[PDB]
Amino acid sequence: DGPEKNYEKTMAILQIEAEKAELRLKELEVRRLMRARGDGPWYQYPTIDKALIDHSPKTTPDN
Amino acid sequence: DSWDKDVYPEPPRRTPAPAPQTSLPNPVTYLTKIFDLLVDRPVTLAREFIEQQHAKNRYYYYHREFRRVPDITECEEKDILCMFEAEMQWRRDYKVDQEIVNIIQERLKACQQREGESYRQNCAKELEQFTQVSKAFQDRYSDLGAHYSARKCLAKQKQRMLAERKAAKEAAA
Secondary structure (H helix, E strand, O other): OOOHHHHOOOOOOOOHHHHHHHHHHHHHHHHHHHHOOOOOOOOOOOOOOOOOOOOOOOOOOOO | OOOOOOOOOOOOOOOOOOOOOOOOOOOHHHHHHHHHHHHHHHHHHHHHHHHHHHHHHOOOOOOOOOOOOOOOOOOOOHHHHHHHHHHHHHHHHHHHHHHHHHHHHHHHHHHHHHHEEEEEEHOHHHHHHHHHHHHHHHHOOOOOOOOOHHHHHHHHHHHHHHHHHHHHHHOOO
């Protein structure tokens, strides 16, 4: 096949690779930031649900 | 002819026109015409056959033409597309340089025997055009490791420009 075949295929190879590599670097950075700050979807560790608590009046007041 | 004197130089031919001082027949001319008659003519007519059958069905080819592309100096860093294109262009220009220095190699090599014991004075200009093709080559392509890249070539050009600017400013203090 003509040189244009291989060459046109290969810059597409390089573009896909680079658009994956900078994505990998940004993924490392995002994962670190979101493990440290935590203000986002993942790396959010569980907590206590607010539905378990009860607000109805109790036997003794001020509790 | 297929070639030309401009890129394949050749000194004008000159022969002594032998005029023997003796009456003995000249042998070399006789053996040459004999070798012409029993060797040159049959191969000549065979090639006549070949030339006519070539002309019977002729096909052509063309110079595979390219075009200029953005180079590393104009290539953006991390821009892999123009990066690869400039790499291709620079490598083919490197091959161009190797080929042209090969032509100068053959020019000077053939000139040495062409000009004789006089080669030291007629090929000197040819030698003059060699002592400058090497040095400039060393300026454009030299010491580029074994993974030579258009980026590394640009880095070497960077060395050259900083060195020449340094010399210019140290001359100007």
